[PDB]
Amino acid sequence: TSTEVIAHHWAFAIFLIVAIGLCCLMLVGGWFLGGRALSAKFYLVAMFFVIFDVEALYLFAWSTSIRESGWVGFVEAAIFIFVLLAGLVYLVRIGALDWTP
């Protein structure tokens, strides 16, 4: 409820509103003005991205509290990263990540 916090909230709201309005108004002006007269490897890559992004979010949560988690948290994240790297090595070696076989 600080005045700095509410001022920054208002500034963020005005930033988003004015930015989206600027883009929309620029397209509106562009439209109104002026006269008139597949392979499955894409799925594989996107699916690998989704899986590795969820494992990335796990590491995202770990990274902000490494000191509070101590060495036992380091050991757990090391097991997590080793399993993730084993899966990555598996995908590379079986040709799943090889774009040109």
Binding site: L38, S39, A40, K41, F42, Y43, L44, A46, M47, F48, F49, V50, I51, D53, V54, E55, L57, Y58, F60, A61, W62, S63, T64, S65, E68, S69, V72, G73, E76, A77, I79, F80, V83, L84, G87, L91, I94, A96
Partner: protein, 162 residues
């Protein structure tokens, strides 16, 4: 923080209602992305900042990308279901709509009558979620890694082309 919650919840409800009654897959996925943005706004209104961040990053930003990838890869151009449009015929949707409405009234009756001092909205940071995640929920983290590994292996074994 109450106004944000109510408008975002209303936007989410309207968006998924337009998701389930739409014919174009890309339009349905777009309304689904709008619903996920609104639900992340609901998360931010409640103080679950990490949850809203992951809702935009992962749910609206990775999984919906996979859905859009699949839709543009299969090239749905009205394969005998768009021209049929059976889900908007009353004899098809009236049954499940009453069934889901009955389930909604039963669940909502259960929701009411529970003691409720209100959600405070105090932010629960990604710091505390990370502390809990690698503290009392270590096995959840490791076995969730194995779960995502299983999903990876299954989706590779089925979904590859050859």
């Amino acid at each position: 923080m109450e106004f944000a919650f109510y408008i975002c919840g209303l936007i989410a409800i309207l968006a998924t209602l337009r998701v389930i009654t739409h014919t174009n897959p890309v339009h349905a996925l777009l309304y689904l992305i709008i619903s996920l943005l609104a639900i992340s706004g609901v998360f931010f209104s409640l103080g679950a900042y990490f949850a809203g961040a992951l809702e935009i990053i992962v749910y609206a930003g990775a999984i919906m990308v996979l859905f859009v990838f699949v839709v543009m890869m299969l090239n749905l151009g009205g394969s005998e279901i768009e021209q049929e449009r059976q889900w908007l015929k009353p004899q098809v949707w009236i049954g499940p709509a009453i069934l889901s409405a009955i389930m909604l009234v039963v669940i909502v009756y259960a929701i009411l009558g529970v003691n409720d001092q209100g959600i405070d909205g105090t932010p629960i940071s990604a710091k505390a979620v990370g502390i809990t995640l690698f503290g009392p929920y270590v096995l959840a983290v490791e076995l969730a890694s194995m779960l995502l590994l299983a999903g990876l292996v299954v989706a590779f074994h089925v979904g590859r082309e050859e």
